[PDB]
C-alpha cells in the first residue's frame, strides 16, 4: 500500500493491474482498507491509470451489488464509496472516457427506460461533489431515449455550453413530463410521486455547499408550477438566497406559498431585509408579527425619523411583567429584540449595543466564544452587530481588550476562518492596521476589493437600490486604500505639502447630503477622523488645522443629519460637541 502512493506512473499502472487481477478472491473485510488508496488517483494525470481505476469500479459496483443480502456494513459501504467516485467520473478532462462511463450508465437496467422513472432515478445520482453540470447531463440522459430531427442534436450540443439555456432546458423538460404524466399513475401514486420528489428536492437543498445560481434558481422555479411542491422548505430556501444572491426567485416562491405560516413570514422578513424595500418590511410587523399595542406605537415612530421613542418602547415591550391579555407568541419575541438592535444601530448607540447583542444568549458576563459561533442564529444576526458595535466603539480610543484576542483565537480552523475572511475583511484590515500587520491588512483589503467584485457581479441588472447599497461603500474602501498608499510613501513626514494636498482633497471630495444616510456617513466620518488621529500619532499648527478639518467634517455631518430629519442624532452630536464648541468663537456661533 505504501509503494502505491509513490511518484511513478508505470508502477501505479501495474499495481492497479494486479489489484484488478486479484479481485474476485479478496475478502470484503480488508477491501474497505484496500479501496481507500485506490480512489486517491482522481487528481492524477495519465488516462491509462485513471482508466484502470474506473475499470475496477465497473465490476465492484456490478457484482458487490448486495441484492438486499444483509451481510455487513463494509460490504454494503463499499457500494456507497464506489458509487461516489463512479458518479464523480463524469467531469474528467478526457472525452471518450466520458463516452465509456456514459455508455455504462446508459446501458440496459442501469437506469430504467420507461420514460420518467428514468428521471426519478436521475434525481438520485446527484452527488453534490458535482452539481455544475447535472442539468446538462440530465437532459442528455433524457433525450437519449429518442430513438424533422435535424435540430435536436445541435440543441443537445448547445445545451452543454451556457448555464442559462441548460437551466431553461431542464425547467422546460421536467415540467413538461410532470404536466403530461396524467395518462396513468393515479392520485395516490401521484401523491406518492410528489412525496418522493419533494423529498429529493429537500435533499438537494440540504446537500449542496458551493451554491450555484442557475441550479438554485432552477429548482426554486420548477417548484412553483405544480400543485404539490409549494411547501418546500421555508427554513433553508431563505438561507440559500441569503448568500446565493438569488433573492427575487425565492420571494416569488414564498408569495405563492403564502397564497392558497409564521416562520414563512419571519424568513420573508429576513429575505426582504437585504434588497431594500423597507415599506413591505414595515408592512409585515403590523399584520402578523404584532397584535399588541406597542408594535403599532413603535412602527408609527419608526416610519419617520423618530428613532428614540420606538427604541424606548421596546425594552418596555420585552421586560414587561404581567400582560395577561394575550401573550407574545412564537412570532414577535425575537423581532422586538432584533428591531431594538437595529433602531439602536440607526443612531449613535456604541455603548449600549454590545450589551443587547450578546447579553441574551448566556450568563451575566461576556463568555464570548464558540457559544456565539454555534447555533448560527447566534452567528448570522447577533454577530454582525456585535463586531460592528465592537470596532465602532474601539476606534475612538480605548483599550477594551477583547476583540484582539477574540479574532486571535478565531482565525484558526476551517469554519472559523472561511467566514471571517470570506465576508468582512475591512474592519479586520483596520484593526490589523491597529495591530500593525499592514501587509496582512494589505491582503485583506485586496480580498475586500475582490469580494466587492464577487458580490457586484451576480447582482442583477434592474434590481435597483440593492446595487446602490452595495455601491456606496467603495469611497470608504478607497479611503483606507489611500491611507495605506499614503503612509508607505516616505516623503510625507519630512515636509508638509502632501499633507496639505491630502487635506485639500479630503475637504474637497465629499459625500453629499440628502442622498447618503447617516450610517455610511458615520462610516466615512469616523474612518477619516480616525485616520486624522492616526497620522497625528505618526508625526510624533497642524493640530489646530486637523481640528479645523475635523470640525468641518462633523459640521457637514450635522447639517446632513438636519436635512434627513434625524434631530436626535444631531442633538446628541451637538451635545457631545457643546464643550467642543467652547474652544473657538466662530465654531460657537
Amino acid at each position: 500500500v505504501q509503494v502505491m502512493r509513490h511518484r511513478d506512473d508505470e508502477r501505479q499502472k501495474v499495481c492497479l493491474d494486479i489489484i484488478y487481477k486479484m479481485m474476485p478472491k479478496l475478502k470484503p473485510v480488508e477491501l474497505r482498507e484496500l479501496l481507500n488508496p485506490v480512489v486517491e488517483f482522481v487528481s492524477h494525470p495519465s488516462t491509462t491509470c485513471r482508466e484502470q481505476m474506473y475499470n475496477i469500479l465497473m465490476w465492484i459496483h456490478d457484482n458487490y451489488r448486495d441484492p438486499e443480502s444483509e451481510t455487513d456494513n463494509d460490504s454494503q459501504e463499499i457500494f456507497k464509496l464506489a458509487k461516489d467516485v463512479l458518479i464523480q467520473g463524469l467531469i474528467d478532462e478526457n472525452p471518450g472516457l466520458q463516452l465509456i462511463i456514459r455508455n455504462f450508465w446508459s446501458h440496459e437496467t442501469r437506469l430504467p427506460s420507461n420514460t420518467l422513472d428514468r428521471l426519478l432515478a436521475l434525481n438520485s445520482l446527484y452527488s453534490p461533489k458535482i452539481e455544475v453540470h447535472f442539468l446538462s447531463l440530465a437532459t442528455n440522459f433524457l433525450l437519449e431515449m429518442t430513438s424533422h430531427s435535424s435540430l435536436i442534436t445541435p440543441l443537445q450540443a448547445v445545451a452543454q455550453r451556457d448555464p442559462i439555456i441548460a437551466k431553461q432546458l431542464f425547467s422546460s423538460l421536467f415540467s413538461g413530463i410532470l404536466k403530461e404524466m396524467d395518462k396513468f399513475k393515479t392520485l395516490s401514486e401521484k401523491n406518492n410521486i410528489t412525496q418522493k420528489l419533494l423529498q429529493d428536492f429537500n435533499r438537494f437543498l440540504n446537500t449542496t455547499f458551493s451554491f450555484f445560481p442557475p441550479f438554485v434558481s432552477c429548482i426554486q422555479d420548477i417548484s412553483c408550477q405544480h400543485a404539490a411542491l409549494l411547501s418546500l422548505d421555508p427554513a433553508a430556501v431563505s438561507a440559500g438566497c441569503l448568500a446565493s444572491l438569488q433573492q427575487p426567485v425565492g420571494i416569488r416562491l414564498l408569495e405563492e406559498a403564502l397564497l392558497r405560516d409564521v416562520l414563512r413570514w419571519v424568513e420573508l422578513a429576513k429575505l426582504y431585509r437585504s434588497i431594500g424595500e423597507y415599506d413591505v418590511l414595515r408592512g409585515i410587523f403590523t399584520s402578523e408579527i404584532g397584535t399588541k399595542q406597542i408594535t403599532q406605537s413603535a412602527l408609527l415612530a419608526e416610519a419617520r425619523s423618530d428613532y428614540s421613542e420606538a427604541a424606548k418602547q421596546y425594552d418596555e415591550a420585552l421586560n414587561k411583567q404581567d400582560w395577561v391579555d394575550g401573550e407574545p407568541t412564537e412570532a414577535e419575541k425575537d423581532f422586538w429584540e432584533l428591531a431594538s438592535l437595529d433602531c439602536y444601530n440607526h443612531l449613535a448607540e456604541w455603548k449600549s449595543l454590545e450589551y443587547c447583542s450578546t447579553a441574551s444568549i448566556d450568563s451575566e458576563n461576556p463568555p464570548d466564544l464558540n457559544k456565539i459561533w454555534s447555533e448560527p442564529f447566534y452567528q448570522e444576526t447577533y454577530l454582525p452587530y456585535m463586531i460592528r458595535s465592537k470596532l465602532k466603539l474601539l476606534l475612538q480610543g480605548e483599550a477594551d481588550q477583547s476583540l484582539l484576542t477574540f479574532i486571535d483565537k478565531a482565525m484558526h480552523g476551517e469554519l472559523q476562518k472561511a467566514i471571517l475572511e470570506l465576508h468582512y475583511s475591512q474592519e479586520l484590515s483596520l484593526l490589523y492596521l491597529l495591530q500593525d500587520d499592514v501587509d496582512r491588512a494589505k491582503y485583506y483589503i485586496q480580498n475586500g476589493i475582490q469580494s466587492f467584485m464577487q458580490n457586484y457581479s451576480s447582482i442583477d441588472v434592474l434590481l435597483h437600490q440593492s446595487r446602490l447599497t452595495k455601491l456606496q461603500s467603495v469611497q470608504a474602501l478607497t479611503e483606507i486604500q489611500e491611507f495605506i498608499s499614503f503612509i508607505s510613501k516616505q516623503g510625507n513626514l519630512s515636509s508638509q505639502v502632501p499633507l496639505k494636498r491630502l487635506l485639500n482633497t479630503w475637504t474637497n471630495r465629499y459625500p453629499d447630503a440628502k442622498m447618503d444616510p447617516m450610517n455610511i456617513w458615520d462610516d466615512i466620518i469616523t474612518n477619516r477622523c480616525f485616520f486624522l488621529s492616526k497620522i497625528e500619532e505618526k508625526l510624533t499648527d497642524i493640530s489646530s488645522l486637523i481640528r479645523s478639518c475635523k470640525f468641518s467634517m462633523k459640521m457637514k455631518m450635522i447639517d446632513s443629519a438636519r436635512k434627513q430629519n434625524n434631530f436626535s442624532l444631531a442633538m446628541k452630536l451637538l451635545k457631545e460637541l457643546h464643550k467642543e464648541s467652547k474652544t473657538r468663537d466662530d465654531w460657537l456661533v
Partner: protein, 285 residues
Amino acid sequence: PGQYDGRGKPLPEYHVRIAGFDERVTVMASLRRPKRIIIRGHDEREHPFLVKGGEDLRQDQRVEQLFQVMNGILAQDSACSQRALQLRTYSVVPMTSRLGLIEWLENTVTLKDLLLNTMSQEEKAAYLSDPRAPPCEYKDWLTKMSGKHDVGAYMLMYKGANRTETVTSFRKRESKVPADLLKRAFVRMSTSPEAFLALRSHFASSHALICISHWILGIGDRHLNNFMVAMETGGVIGIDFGHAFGSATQFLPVPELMPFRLTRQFINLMLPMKETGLMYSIMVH
C-alpha cells in the same frame, strides 16, 4: 415652441427649427376625434404631436406648471429624494383659443385597454357585453331600488336604500370580476420573476404618488381613460383634465366623494400584503 421655459438664458441656435411634415395623419377613434402628425426637425430627429381643436386649452398649461412646482418641492427634501419620487409632466402648447397641441408619448396604452386585452376571450366578453354585466347589473339594480328608468333614479337611490342592502348588492358585482387581473397583466409580459417585482414596485409608487397629489388640488372624474400606463418601464401617467379645484362634487348632479381611485384591482395586486405597507408609506411620506 414648448421651449422657452425660463430657467436660464435662452438660446435659439439649438432649438428645433421646423423643417418638414409627414406624409401621414392618424386618427384617434374617440368622441372629439383628435388627429395626430409626425413633424420633423432640422436637428435630424422626429417629434410626434396630437391636434385637438374646439377646446379652450388655457388651464391645462397652468396645472402642468403647478405639477412642475409640485415635483420641484418633492425632490427638494431628503426622505423622498432617497426613493426618487417624481411626477411625469408633459407639454401642451396653447396655439390660440380653441386650438392647442398635445405632446405625445411612445407605445403607451390606456388603463382600460390594458385591462380589456389582458383578459382572455371569455372574461373580456363578460365584462364588455353580458346579460349580468357589472354595468348592466348595476343599471338593473338602479331600476330595482328606484322604480324609474332614467336619470333622477340616482337621486332617488339614497332615499330608497339602506346601507347593508347596497353593501351586499355591491358584493354581488364585486364577485363578478377576477381578483389579480392586474397581476395577470404583469405576468402576461414580464417573462422573468427577476423583473416582475421591479415592475410591480414601480407601478405601485407611481399610482400612490399621483393619488396623493390628485387630492391637494382635488380633481374628481378620474374614470378609466385618464391613466396612460407605459409598458416600457412600468409607469402610469394621467391625462384629460375635467375640473380643477374641488368642483367636481359641487356642480355635478350626482356628486362623488372619493379623493381618488383605489378600487379592487390596486388592492388585489398587492396581495398577499394588505394595503398597509407600501402605498401607505408612500402617501404619508
